[PDB]
From a paper:
Human coilin-interacting nuclear ATPase protein hCINAP, also known as adenylate kinase 6, is highly conserved in eukaryotes. hCINAP is a typical α/β protein with a structure common to adenylate kinases. Adenylate kinases play important roles in nucleotide metabolism by catalysing reversible transfer of the γ-phosphate of ATP to AMP, forming two molecules of ADP22. Here we show that hCINAP is required for human 18S rRNA processing. hCINAP is highly expressed in cancers and promotes cancer cell growth through selectively upregulates the translation of cancer-associated genes.
To further assess the involvement of the enzymatic activity of hCINAP in 18S rRNA processing, northern blotting and ribosome profiling were performed with the enzymatic mutants hCINAP-D77G and hCINAP-H79G. Comparison of the crystal structure of hCINAP-D77G with that of wild-type hCINAP showed that no significant conformation occurred in the substrate-binding pocket of hCINAP-D77G; only a subtle conformational difference in the NMP-binding domain with a 0.354 Å root mean square deviation was observed. AP5A treatment did not significantly alter 18S rRNA abundance, suggesting that the ATPase activity of hCINAP is involved in 18S rRNA maturation. Interestingly, the ATPase activity of hCINAP was strongly stimulated by RPS14, suggesting that RPS14 regulates the role of hCINAP in 18S rRNA processing by acting as an ATPase-activating protein. The association of RPS14 with hCINAP was decreased by the addition of ATP, but not by AMP-PNP. This result suggests that ATP hydrolysis by hCINAP modulates dissociation of the hCINAP–RPS14 complex. Collectively, these data demonstrate that hCINAP functions as an ATP-regulated switch that interacts with RPS14 and Nob1, and is required for Nob1-mediated 18S rRNA processing.
Residue numbers in the entry: -2 to 172
The structure:
Amino acid sequence: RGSMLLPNILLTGTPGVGKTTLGKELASKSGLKYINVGDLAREEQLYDGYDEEYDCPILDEDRVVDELDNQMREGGVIVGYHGCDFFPERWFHIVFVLRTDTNVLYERLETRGYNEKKLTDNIQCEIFQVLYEEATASYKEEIVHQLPSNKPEELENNVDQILKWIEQWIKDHNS
Ligand SMILES: Nc1ncnc2c1ncn2[C@@H]1O[C@H](COP(=O)(O)OP(=O)(O)O)[C@@H](O)[C@H]1O
């Protein structure tokens, strides 16, 4: 019922940690909408510049924000991306940074067929905790949380914890 106020959630962390697997499952089991920012920019061609080095077009951050702004004002969206400093702070009610042990994350990305230089850049992003610090610099510390994401059983505990959070938030914000 388009009579209920619904929350917005950010899922962030290094490529490989489990963001899209977790977001699709939360969407199926809550009725909220999951948007993968990478897939959105491909579908709507939201790019400015090309990367010869990595062989890929470069994300246009301001056109991403314009494209999503009205949907975000209406509520009930889960957003997934490997960055977060350029999103409006007002968009999110809670932020989760997914974390994966370096040994486990290395094997996930190798099987996806990343080359040597791509492997190294992402493994260093995780061991230096880059996305965790970006989140704490951009949102209030009490709404930012780290989630372990190394095995099926952790995926299952994350789904259960976030589904319960969503049910309690809806009760508190529809008196
Ligand atoms: N908790 C988990 N346990 C084991 N494998 C996982 C877990 N979460 C995700 N994966 C797997 O890791 C790989 C990358 O997950 P994905 O959703 O594509 O990462 P991201 O969206 O952050 O780049 C996929 O093969 C997926 O099945």
